[PDB]
Design a protein around this motif. Sequence first.
Motif, PDB file in Angstrom:
ATOM      1  N   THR A  32     -48.525  18.485  32.071  1.00  0.00           N
ATOM      2  CA  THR A  32     -48.439  17.081  32.452  1.00  0.00           C
ATOM      3  C   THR A  32     -47.874  16.904  33.858  1.00  0.00           C
ATOM      4  OG1 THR A  32     -48.137  16.528  30.136  1.00  0.00           O
ATOM      5  CG2 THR A  32     -47.502  14.861  31.757  1.00  0.00           C
ATOM      6  N   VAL A  33     -48.516  16.041  34.653  1.00  0.00           N
ATOM      7  CA  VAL A  33     -48.087  15.732  36.014  1.00  0.00           C
ATOM      8  C   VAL A  33     -47.875  14.226  36.163  1.00  0.00           C
ATOM      9  CG1 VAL A  33     -49.188  17.764  37.006  1.00  0.00           C
ATOM     10  CG2 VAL A  33     -50.481  15.635  36.842  1.00  0.00           C
ATOM     11  N   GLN A  34     -46.984  13.846  37.079  1.00  0.00           N
ATOM     12  CA  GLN A  34     -46.785  12.438  37.406  1.00  0.00           C
ATOM     13  C   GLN A  34     -47.777  12.028  38.485  1.00  0.00           C
ATOM     14  OE1 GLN A  34     -43.130  11.294  39.413  1.00  0.00           O
ATOM     15  NE2 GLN A  34     -42.834   9.525  38.065  1.00  0.00           N
ATOM     16  N   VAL A  35     -48.330  10.818  38.371  1.00  0.00           N
ATOM     17  CA  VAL A  35     -49.324  10.343  39.329  1.00  0.00           C
ATOM     18  C   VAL A  35     -48.952   8.936  39.764  1.00  0.00           C
ATOM     19  CG1 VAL A  35     -51.743   9.741  39.743  1.00  0.00           C
ATOM     20  CG2 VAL A  35     -51.137  11.790  38.396  1.00  0.00           C
ATOM     21  N   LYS A  36     -48.946   8.700  41.073  1.00  0.00           N
ATOM     22  CA  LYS A  36     -48.494   7.439  41.631  1.00  0.00           C
ATOM     23  C   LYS A  36     -49.665   6.619  42.162  1.00  0.00           C
ATOM     24  CE  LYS A  36     -43.920   9.220  42.801  1.00  0.00           C
ATOM     25  NZ  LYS A  36     -43.111   8.327  41.932  1.00  0.00           N
ATOM     26  N   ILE A  37     -49.531   5.302  42.064  1.00  0.00           N
ATOM     27  CA  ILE A  37     -50.484   4.348  42.620  1.00  0.00           C
ATOM     28  C   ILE A  37     -49.836   3.697  43.837  1.00  0.00           C
ATOM     29  CG2 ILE A  37     -51.904   2.324  42.190  1.00  0.00           C
ATOM     30  CD1 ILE A  37     -51.737   2.972  39.197  1.00  0.00           C
ATOM     31  N   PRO A  38     -50.393   3.843  45.038  1.00  0.00           N
ATOM     32  CA  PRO A  38     -49.839   3.121  46.193  1.00  0.00           C
ATOM     33  C   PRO A  38     -49.862   1.612  45.971  1.00  0.00           C
ATOM     34  CG  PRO A  38     -51.362   4.846  46.903  1.00  0.00           C
ATOM     35  CD  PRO A  38     -51.527   4.710  45.412  1.00  0.00           C
ATOM     36  N   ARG A  39     -48.823   0.941  46.472  1.00  0.00           N
ATOM     37  CA  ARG A  39     -48.646  -0.483  46.205  1.00  0.00           C
ATOM     38  C   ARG A  39     -49.834  -1.314  46.673  1.00  0.00           C
ATOM     39  NH1 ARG A  39     -42.802  -2.232  47.557  1.00  0.00           N
ATOM     40  NH2 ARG A  39     -42.629  -0.930  45.683  1.00  0.00           N
ATOM     41  N   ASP A  40     -50.542  -0.868  47.718  1.00  0.00           N
ATOM     42  CA  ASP A  40     -51.667  -1.614  48.273  1.00  0.00           C
ATOM     43  C   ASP A  40     -53.011  -1.210  47.670  1.00  0.00           C
ATOM     44  OD1 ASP A  40     -51.664   0.934  49.538  1.00  0.00           O
ATOM     45  OD2 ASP A  40     -52.339   0.137  51.469  1.00  0.00           O
ATOM     46  N   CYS A  41     -53.012  -0.430  46.601  1.00  0.00           N
ATOM     47  CA  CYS A  41     -54.246   0.092  46.025  1.00  0.00           C
ATOM     48  C   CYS A  41     -54.433  -0.393  44.598  1.00  0.00           C
ATOM     49  CB  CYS A  41     -54.241   1.618  46.032  1.00  0.00           C
ATOM     50  SG  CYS A  41     -54.363   2.319  47.674  1.00  0.00           S
ATOM     51  N   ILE A  42     -55.655  -0.214  44.092  1.00  0.00           N
ATOM     52  CA  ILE A  42     -55.961  -0.425  42.679  1.00  0.00           C
ATOM     53  C   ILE A  42     -56.451   0.902  42.124  1.00  0.00           C
ATOM     54  CG2 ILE A  42     -57.364  -1.710  40.987  1.00  0.00           C
ATOM     55  CD1 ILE A  42     -57.776  -3.812  43.319  1.00  0.00           C
ATOM     56  N   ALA A  43     -55.978   1.291  40.944  1.00  0.00           N
ATOM     57  CA  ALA A  43     -56.481   2.529  40.362  1.00  0.00           C
ATOM     58  C   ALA A  43     -57.355   2.221  39.157  1.00  0.00           C
ATOM     59  CB  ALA A  43     -55.342   3.471  39.957  1.00  0.00           C
ATOM     60  N   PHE A  44     -58.233   3.169  38.809  1.00  0.00           N
ATOM     61  CA  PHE A  44     -59.130   3.012  37.668  1.00  0.00           C
ATOM     62  C   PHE A  44     -59.083   4.267  36.822  1.00  0.00           C
ATOM     63  CE2 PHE A  44     -60.510   0.003  40.761  1.00  0.00           C
ATOM     64  CZ  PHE A  44     -60.774  -1.134  39.994  1.00  0.00           C
ATOM     65  N   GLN A  45     -58.744   4.110  35.544  1.00  0.00           N
ATOM     66  CA  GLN A  45     -58.787   5.217  34.593  1.00  0.00           C
ATOM     67  C   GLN A  45     -60.033   5.123  33.719  1.00  0.00           C
ATOM     68  OE1 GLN A  45     -54.582   4.660  33.200  1.00  0.00           O
ATOM     69  NE2 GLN A  45     -54.622   6.905  33.087  1.00  0.00           N
ATOM     70  N   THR A  46     -60.646   6.267  33.446  1.00  0.00           N
ATOM     71  CA  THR A  46     -61.765   6.302  32.517  1.00  0.00           C
ATOM     72  C   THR A  46     -61.289   6.174  31.077  1.00  0.00           C
ATOM     73  OG1 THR A  46     -61.572   8.675  32.719  1.00  0.00           O
ATOM     74  CG2 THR A  46     -63.342   7.583  33.929  1.00  0.00           C
ATOM     75  N   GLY A  47     -62.115   5.542  30.241  1.00  0.00           N
ATOM     76  CA  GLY A  47     -61.839   5.414  28.829  1.00  0.00           C
ATOM     77  C   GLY A  47     -62.925   6.040  27.966  1.00  0.00           C
ATOM     78  N   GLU A  48     -62.675   6.035  26.651  1.00  0.00           N
ATOM     79  CA  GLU A  48     -63.548   6.769  25.730  1.00  0.00           C
ATOM     80  C   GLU A  48     -64.957   6.194  25.674  1.00  0.00           C
ATOM     81  OE1 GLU A  48     -61.843   8.688  22.174  1.00  0.00           O
ATOM     82  OE2 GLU A  48     -60.427   7.006  22.219  1.00  0.00           O
ATOM     83  N   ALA A  49     -65.116   4.886  25.861  1.00  0.00           N
ATOM     84  CA  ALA A  49     -66.471   4.344  25.826  1.00  0.00           C
ATOM     85  C   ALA A  49     -67.300   4.858  26.999  1.00  0.00           C
ATOM     86  CB  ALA A  49     -66.432   2.814  25.806  1.00  0.00           C
ATOM     87  N   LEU A  50     -66.684   4.984  28.183  1.00  0.00           N
ATOM     88  CA  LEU A  50     -67.415   5.535  29.323  1.00  0.00           C
ATOM     89  C   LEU A  50     -67.716   7.014  29.109  1.00  0.00           C
ATOM     90  CD1 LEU A  50     -66.953   4.827  33.053  1.00  0.00           C
ATOM     91  CD2 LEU A  50     -66.897   7.199  32.264  1.00  0.00           C
ATOM     92  N   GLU A  51     -66.762   7.751  28.537  1.00  0.00           N
ATOM     93  CA  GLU A  51     -67.022   9.142  28.174  1.00  0.00           C
ATOM     94  C   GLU A  51     -68.238   9.248  27.257  1.00  0.00           C
ATOM     95  OE1 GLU A  51     -63.630  11.467  26.788  1.00  0.00           O
ATOM     96  OE2 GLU A  51     -64.932  12.508  25.361  1.00  0.00           O
ATOM     97  N   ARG A  52     -68.316   8.387  26.240  1.00  0.00           N
ATOM     98  CA  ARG A  52     -69.456   8.461  25.326  1.00  0.00           C
ATOM     99  C   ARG A  52     -70.758   8.095  26.044  1.00  0.00           C
ATOM    100  NH1 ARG A  52     -68.442   9.381  19.867  1.00  0.00           N
ATOM    101  NH2 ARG A  52     -70.429   9.669  18.768  1.00  0.00           N
ATOM    102  N   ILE A  53     -70.723   7.056  26.891  1.00  0.00           N
ATOM    103  CA  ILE A  53     -71.923   6.619  27.615  1.00  0.00           C
ATOM    104  C   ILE A  53     -72.450   7.712  28.541  1.00  0.00           C
ATOM    105  CG2 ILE A  53     -72.638   5.034  29.476  1.00  0.00           C
ATOM    106  CD1 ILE A  53     -70.921   2.883  27.959  1.00  0.00           C
ATOM    107  N   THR A  54     -71.558   8.529  29.112  1.00  0.00           N
ATOM    108  CA  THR A  54     -71.971   9.614  29.993  1.00  0.00           C
ATOM    109  C   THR A  54     -72.115  10.943  29.261  1.00  0.00           C
ATOM    110  OG1 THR A  54     -69.698  10.126  30.704  1.00  0.00           O
ATOM    111  CG2 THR A  54     -70.918   8.473  31.978  1.00  0.00           C
ATOM    112  N   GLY A  55     -72.104  10.926  27.929  1.00  0.00           N
ATOM    113  CA  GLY A  55     -72.261  12.147  27.156  1.00  0.00           C
ATOM    114  C   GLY A  55     -71.218  13.197  27.449  1.00  0.00           C
TER     115      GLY A  55
END
Length: 346
Positions: free
Chosen positions: A265-288
Amino acid sequence: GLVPRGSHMAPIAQAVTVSLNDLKNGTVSLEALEEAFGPDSLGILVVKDVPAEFAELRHRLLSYSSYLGNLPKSELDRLENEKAKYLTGWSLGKETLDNLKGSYYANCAFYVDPSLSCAKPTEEFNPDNFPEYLSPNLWPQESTLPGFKPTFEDLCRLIIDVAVLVARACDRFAEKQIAGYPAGYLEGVVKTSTTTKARLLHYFPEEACATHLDHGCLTGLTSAMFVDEAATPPVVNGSLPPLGELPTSPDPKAGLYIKSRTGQTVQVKIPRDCIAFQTGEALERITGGKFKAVPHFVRGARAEMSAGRIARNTLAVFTQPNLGDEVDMEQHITFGEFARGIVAKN
Ligand SMILES: Cc1cn([C@H]2C[C@H](O)[C@@H](CO)O2)c(=O)[nH]c1=O
Ligand SMILES: [Mn+2]
């Protein structure tokens, strides 16, 4: 034990970062996208160069999280919805290692049609059989929390607009790599969804399996706002000014932790001026499985560092399909079925 106990720190890892300009012009690298979302990835993409209004909207809405969390109990009780499994409106939850955190949930049907408080109900999909997605939004009173609803909608709309462009890049990858993939599928699913759900979270100050997968397609994230609520009281008292954001987190161990397939496990930071996007299980299923939802968790600040004064506010926007949209295109499993735990169909 995923993260070291005590004062010891996990290593910090850098998330793949792209510019919104390249998302808009269609020149984002699919190599970078696969590095961000692929099977060996952290399942997260940081987007910089975001619209100019983002900074103020983030500051205002994360301030609203503190104001909302401190409204009189009589007002907050009106925002509770037990039938929706507390996935609409306000509720109190707890995090243990020992932090109290209030959540405010709203569907984002307004993105598609600003007049909608939720998806238009049908016999197949309505608040009685899917209350956790289709219940009407419950808003605080305008007189007691002025400006909350338009600020919430505007920031969610900005984040979803960016999510649509991230989905478009995912479609470019899938159209190149997956035989039979429907062109433009993820972009259309995100852009037309009335089930996308936003969560505004408030960690209350306190005195001195761990991971999950997101279930949807793409989760938009702001960086967290820490507030000294003794210095800038979260009390509604002309426009409503934002509260004071602490420049630096009071607890360097607070934040997002991701466990890639390396098993560590690693720590991951989001810069204050940015937006981050995490993938979820529905996208995993859609992309096989070519893109993966990656296990992760969020830690609040330790009470020693909150010192009974410092609160923590965040926004997450879970973009996800409409209940009738397919997520497994071989077995024709819909998102509603997938959400009810169905993993096979014939
Ligand atoms: C409420 C909600 C959560 N999530 C994320 C955060 C939860 O911890 C996880 C499992 O529901 O998925 C979604 O993807 N969609 C939703 O509608
Ligand atoms: Mn998550």
